[PDB]
Amino acid sequence: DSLSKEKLLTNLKLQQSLLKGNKVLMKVFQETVINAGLPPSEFWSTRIPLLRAFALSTSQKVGPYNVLSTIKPVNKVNVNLSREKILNIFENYPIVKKAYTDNVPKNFKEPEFWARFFSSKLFRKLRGEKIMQNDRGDVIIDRYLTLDQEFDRKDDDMLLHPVKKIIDLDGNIQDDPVVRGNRPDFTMQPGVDINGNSDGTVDILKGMNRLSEKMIMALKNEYNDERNELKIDDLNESYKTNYAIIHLKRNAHEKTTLKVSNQQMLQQLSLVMDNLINKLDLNQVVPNNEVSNKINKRVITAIKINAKQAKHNLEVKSTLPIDLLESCRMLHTTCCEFLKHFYIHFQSGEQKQASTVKKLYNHLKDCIEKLNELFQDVLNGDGESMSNTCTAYLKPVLNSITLATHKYDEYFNEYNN
Amino acid sequence: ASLVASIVEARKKRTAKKNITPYQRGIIRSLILTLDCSEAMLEKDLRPNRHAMIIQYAIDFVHEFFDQNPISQMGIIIMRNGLAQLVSQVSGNPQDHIDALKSIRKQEPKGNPSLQNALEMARGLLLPVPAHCTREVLIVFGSLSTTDPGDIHQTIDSLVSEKIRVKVLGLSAQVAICKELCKATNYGDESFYKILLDETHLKELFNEAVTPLPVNKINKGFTLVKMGFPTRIFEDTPTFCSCHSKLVYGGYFCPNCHSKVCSLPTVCPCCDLMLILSTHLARSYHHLMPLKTFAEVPTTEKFRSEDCFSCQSRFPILTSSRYRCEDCKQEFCVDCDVFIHEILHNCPGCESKPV
Amino acid sequence: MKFYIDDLPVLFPYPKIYPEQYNYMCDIKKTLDVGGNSILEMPSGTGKTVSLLSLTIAYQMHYPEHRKIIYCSRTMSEIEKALVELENLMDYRTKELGYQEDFRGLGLTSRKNLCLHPEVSKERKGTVVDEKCRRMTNGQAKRKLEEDPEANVELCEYHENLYNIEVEDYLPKGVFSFEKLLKYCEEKTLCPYFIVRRMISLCNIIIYSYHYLLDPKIAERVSNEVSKDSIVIFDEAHNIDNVCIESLSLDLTTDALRRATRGANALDERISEVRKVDSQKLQDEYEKLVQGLHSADILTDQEEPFVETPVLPQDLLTEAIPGNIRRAEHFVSFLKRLIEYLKTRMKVLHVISETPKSFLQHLKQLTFIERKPLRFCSERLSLLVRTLEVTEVEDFTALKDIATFATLISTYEEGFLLIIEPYEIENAAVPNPIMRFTCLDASIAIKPVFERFSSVIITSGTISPLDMYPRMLNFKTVLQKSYAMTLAKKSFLPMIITKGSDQVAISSRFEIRNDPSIVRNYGSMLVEFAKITPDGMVVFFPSYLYMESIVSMWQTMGILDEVWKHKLILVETPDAQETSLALETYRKACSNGRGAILLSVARGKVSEGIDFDHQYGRTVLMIGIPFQYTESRILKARLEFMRENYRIRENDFLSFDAMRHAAQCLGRVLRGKDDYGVMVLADRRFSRKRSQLPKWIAQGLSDADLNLSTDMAISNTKQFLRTMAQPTDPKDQEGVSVWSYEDLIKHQNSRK
Ligand code: SF4
Ligand SMILES: [Zn+2]
Ligand SMILES: [Zn+2]
Ligand SMILES: [Zn+2]
Ligand SMILES: [Zn+2]
């Protein structure tokens, strides 16, 4: 289905679809392929989960439901039609879909059609309403009555299937074919009208049963056992988890990249217990104001250093021209995209990746030179008034990029040379 | 006579926690909470309504899950009007899903549920997930039925084949299909289809769902994983970030490809490698090193001490409230027992006692 | 698990067992030791069939008597249940002993269920199916094809293969299901009906319907190849009196009379043609009747009697045919004037009820036909059909019915009655007269059973009171006790809804049937229970017309549209096949958990062998008292006869039958102890009937539950669902409800 990497890369229409959904994706994609000419497959190669998420979001569909039962008759009536529910009616009733498609594009209007439909007795029949000759219906819609009837016959023919003997009430009533007793009660048998005909409640009940069967066979779509069926689980062994416990052997390496004696510590301990019981003065704790002044110097130095650390506690406010700010952000973004794709190629590790690595190396070099030329532009646009800040802002991505270039050169010298 | 009822209730409670095991429990987690926002949760039957409390409890659940287990990504898909709507991709930042849930606050829950569609696109979202990550889904549900487009059993078989588990927290009562899901997905266990009895029970259930789950021996995936500790800088100049492409005063620096990021514990956007701190990995060590329960000594027998070893307070006097750590042979009060067993994760008696 | 009774080794296919099952086995073994019959009542929520089957198998193997086993039920569903459980038990025994013992046991049913002749299989009337099978395998067809292979009267190759191989060669030992037998006969091209008809003398245990034991026509054959001193058990036959009643009751319609006239004329003209072309066969039959031969005398096994023996064989006439009906033309004129007499009696203007003796006296007053020819009619007609070779028997099935009626009414006089009423439908366009033959007693058919077999076990799950069945049927049992539900915790919650949401009572009375307020209440709690019901719910009205009215007018209110939004709704169709598709739909709907509702009559076809469990049995809406139709002269004559016989209060018996039908409706919820369900009583009048109700049922019926409304019914049901949604510690039931082998040992020592 539409789930492989090849399928997701193939769906150019879906790619354009979420392209048109976003705006920074036009920005990024335009710079990536319209401006830089990157292979758009490798563009989308990162965004594969996003593509699949968009596809699966677009791909779901609802389950069937009794749309005619949700239809209410609502003096006068005003049509308040919902197109999704109109298509729901179409899907649930292909007869109604057909009656739409041979009359509205031929004879009259859609709201006129639906007014005729709500007027029609075919609507009442298809809904849970007993038909009545007092009702006149709509003649145009009610011409489809026998067509819907033969649809019902064909659908019932489809719905017929053999039954399991474990639950077969037909086999149950065919237990004794020579039962000769008495005629059962009118109460508990299906009653009829005065002239022997039925009222049709059996028809409406078999119709709603047909609706249920159509439901469940819509569920039963494309998208022996009695031994298991008759198991009595209540007298069986309880399930126990096979979860594995874990122990932990403990032997850690010592930290890598004079010794005191009991006599000497005991001597000092005796002496300091003697000093402890001897004396203790709070007043002697006051310092000499000179070594204390050096303490003041050290403390104040630490305060100054950490205060300058705290002095640099939406992005930050900047005094850039907004266009050059956007241009440099754009350049940073496409350089980051290039760098990530180059790392993807490099960490992949194949000889098939070699030309890709070389070409992305060329692109990184081009980005470097374009960064330098941008620095020349902000040079002769500022006189290095705040072109220094431009260079420093674009610095760390450039450092990482050129570090990657050095890594590529080093591995080239490692393998080839 | 209330103390006898409290004692027998504590006995019937402790009968479940008598067995404490050092099972291998998942750390690299993958948790999905789908939300239904349908007509059922519009009931004000619990105050103020089911939608509001599940919103609040989901806020708490997000906070607790990210606090305890910051080494997982969190995705939320809402269910509404016969459609399941993705609102939260799996991410390391909880704040994104917090904002998405805040959007879910003001909108109106309505419609009917479709676990088939919900679980199908949850499967699809869970598809590009590495092997060590434990794919598991929490599902909240208030209906007693489910309108669906097609079969659920094919989805059940696919989910079992793709090694993803589920846990259902139903609202009203048991639904047989949800029982079937929990049993078949959960190797025949019935310890996953849970029904609350009040909102406090719902709170306790959410707290229970916070915890990591044990893994199975047959589901063996024992391997290594590449890891990298980054380094934080505090620069004078604001600098462009790789992730959000904007000027940052500080930021960690990539250990491998020397780029910079804005938040942790996150993977690299550039060298594409996971970056953490040792605090984050040690955070689950109480799960890795569980604590034994502490036993009250009986009131009849002679007592080692008459006041609490840890908090240093007098033991109250019918029964004896002296919870003993047999690993350190010291008795403690109930308050200290609660704190050491839940908040703390060490026994100071065993810290003082040399091994 | 396996333990020993005092001399009886016994194996249970599960490690666990219930103490109620143990006491049940104890009393059954006590009954088997003492000899005779006993009545035991047990809560059907515990396992029954497996335990009794294990006891019977252990009894036959351990004791040197090795008596056969007779078990009977109502439906193919119950028979298949027994087959599956028996297969599981014998598989477990084979595994436990490490080897398979020699064993034979099968069921018994119709060719409509069984005849794999694919051409014959495509008919819906089992009578037509059997008739075609006789037409092309009756032996006469085989002989005609043997003398003339050019004759186009084919034979059933299934039957041919069964001719080829022998009766022990038909199957290996053991038990085979209906499905397994279908696979086997599909493989080997064998007729399973014929196979079963030859397995009768060989099966260690035989299972068939209650009809095959009660009706003489389908029971004499069973009595032929059954051992007299086997073991007989009955299950859930607490409504078997109705089967007994219909075993000897018959009705007469105008069109049947017309068909009888046409068939008699066709037979008369055929006899005239045969007398014209070759009178040798007629003279041969006439002289064979002069010697006085009978159906068993002349007919072989491969040919079957046309008019099957309507009466019990203990009451048959075995002497010669009178000369007045001995000739074929004499017998035709005899039957025709019988038809004419019936047409004369046919045109009364009101309700007629007379004794058969009085009818006989009137008949011999008007015409000159005696009880001896009027009894011999069926045998004479069967012989005439056999000689006549009139196998296109379509016009003569009414002749079979009329000969059956004549023979039956000429056989008995006490506990039988004839009802003639001028309207078949009272409230129709025109009245249509009817003659109805009845059998006022029910214990007539059990007399061959009781006097042929001693080791007969009568037991059920919903039989109450125990003494009422020996009251209504002249039999006695050795011990009469029930079993209480030794429950650890409550699992079933019955409610008695004596009032609606507006504190308005509800009842199912047909006069007040079209009451819109009662409709509003009924739809009200129907909606409420639909909204709170998770998986599966069933509704049981007392009558189909009551349904049809009340469902059509809730369809007028559109309440069913609201009900659509939560579950499916399934209604008992008059077609059992569509009903089967409907119950399959309900089954699959509760399987996928989207939820569905069944609508079936309290006496309807669902209620007699279909169980519901753990999502299917969750909550039941029983609708009112399922009283029978009040103005039946048949019912009133029954009431008069049973009151005259056993001094039975009529209204009390009516409440009993209502009573027992309600219990049969509500007994299909709790399959295992793990299951749970809630019961409702949707009538005000039920509150006086808890003393009537079965003991284990009513023990959960608390005194606060005796008169409830919709609101606390809803609250209690929600709280019950909340309760049953919780797990349970095994320690609370490890020794009081679920028993291990050691638990049973400890209990046995405690008894010691
Ligand atoms: S011969 Fe066998 S298969 Fe054919 S109709 Fe008779 S019983 Fe059925
Ligand atoms: Zn950033
Ligand atoms: Zn990196
Ligand atoms: Zn303390
Ligand atoms: Zn300790």
From Swiss-Prot, chain A:
One of its GO terms (molecular function) is phosphatidylinositol-5-phosphate binding. This is General transcription and DNA repair factor IIH subunit TFB1. Keywords: DNA damage, DNA repair, Nucleus, Phosphoprotein, Repeat, Transcription, Transcription regulation. It is found in: Nucleus. GO terms for cellular component: cytosol; nucleotide-excision repair factor 3 complex; nucleus; transcription factor TFIIH core complex; transcription factor TFIIH holo complex. Its main location: nucleus. Transmembrane segments: none annotated. Residues 1-55, 75-125 form the BSD domain. Component of the 7-subunit TFIIH core complex composed of XPB/SSL2, XPD/RAD3, SSL1, TFB1, TFB2, TFB4 and TFB5, which is active in NER. The core complex associates with the 3-subunit CTD-kinase module TFIIK composed of CCL1, KIN28 and TFB3 to form the 10-subunit holoenzyme (holo-TFIIH) active in transcription. An additionnal subunit, TFB6, plays a role in the dissociation of the SSL2 helicase from TFIIH after transcription initiation. TFB1 interacts with XPC/RAD4. XPC/RAD4 recruits TFIIH to the NER machinery. Interacts with the NER 3'-endonuclease XPG/RAD2. Present with 5150 molecules/cell in log phase SD medium. GO terms for biological process: DNA repair; nucleotide-excision repair; transcription by RNA polymerase I; transcription by RNA polymerase II; transcription initiation at RNA polymerase II promoter. It comes from Saccharomyces cerevisiae (strain ATCC 204508 / S288c) (Baker's yeast). Belongs to the TFB1 family.
UniProtKB/Swiss-Prot annotation, chain B:
Belongs to the GTF2H2 family. One of its GO terms (biological process) is regulation of transcription by RNA polymerase II. One of its GO terms (cellular component) is transcription factor TFIIH core complex. The keyword Ribosomal protein does not apply. This is General transcription and DNA repair factor IIH subunit SSL1. Component of the general transcription and DNA repair factor IIH (TFIIH) core complex, which is involved in general and transcription-coupled nucleotide excision repair (NER) of damaged DNA and, when complexed to TFIIK, in RNA transcription by RNA polymerase II. In NER, TFIIH acts by opening DNA around the lesion to allow the excision of the damaged oligonucleotide and its replacement by a new DNA fragment. In transcription, TFIIH has an essential role in transcription initiation. Component of the 7-subunit TFIIH core complex composed of XPB/SSL2, XPD/RAD3, SSL1, TFB1, TFB2, TFB4 and TFB5, which is active in NER. The core complex associates with the 3-subunit CTD-kinase module TFIIK composed of CCL1, KIN28 and TFB3 to form the 10-subunit holoenzyme (holo-TFIIH) active in transcription. An additionnal subunit, TFB6, plays a role in the dissociation of the SSL2 helicase from TFIIH after transcription initiation. Keywords: DNA damage, DNA repair, Metal-binding, Nucleus, Transcription, Transcription regulation, Zinc, Zinc-finger. GO terms for molecular function: ubiquitin protein ligase activity; zinc ion binding. The keyword 4Fe-4S does not apply. It is found in: Nucleus. A zinc finger (C4-type) spans 254-271. The chain holds residues 96 to 459 of 461 of the full protein.
UniProtKB/Swiss-Prot annotation, chain C:
Present with 14400 molecules/cell in log phase SD medium. Optimum pH is 5.6 for both helicase and ATPase activites, suggesting they are coupled. Signal peptide: none annotated. It catalyses: Couples ATP hydrolysis with the unwinding of duplex DNA at the replication fork by translocating in the 5'-3' direction. This creates two antiparallel DNA single strands (ssDNA). The leading ssDNA polymer is the template for DNA polymerase III holoenzyme which synthesizes a continuous strand; ATP + H2O = ADP + phosphate + H(+). Disruption phenotype: Essential, it cannot be deleted. ATP-dependent 5'-3' DNA helicase. Component of the general transcription and DNA repair factor IIH (TFIIH) core complex, which is involved in general and transcription-coupled nucleotide excision repair (NER) of damaged DNA and, when complexed to TFIIK, in RNA transcription by RNA polymerase II. In NER, TFIIH acts by opening DNA around the lesion to allow the excision of the damaged oligonucleotide and its replacement by a new DNA fragment. The ATP-dependent helicase activity of XPD/RAD3 is required for DNA opening. In transcription, TFIIH has an essential role in transcription initiation. Component of the 7-subunit TFIIH core complex composed of XPB/SSL2, XPD/RAD3, SSL1, TFB1, TFB2, TFB4 and TFB5, which is active in NER. The core complex associates with the 3-subunit CTD-kinase module TFIIK composed of CCL1, KIN28 and TFB3 to form the 10-subunit holoenzyme (holo-TFIIH) active in transcription. An additionnal subunit, TFB6, plays a role in the dissociation of the SSL2 helicase from TFIIH after transcription initiation. The keyword ATP-binding applies. It comes from Saccharomyces cerevisiae (strain ATCC 204508 / S288c). SMART domains: DEXDc2, HELICc2. Disulfide bonds: none annotated. Belongs to the helicase family. RAD3/XPD subfamily.
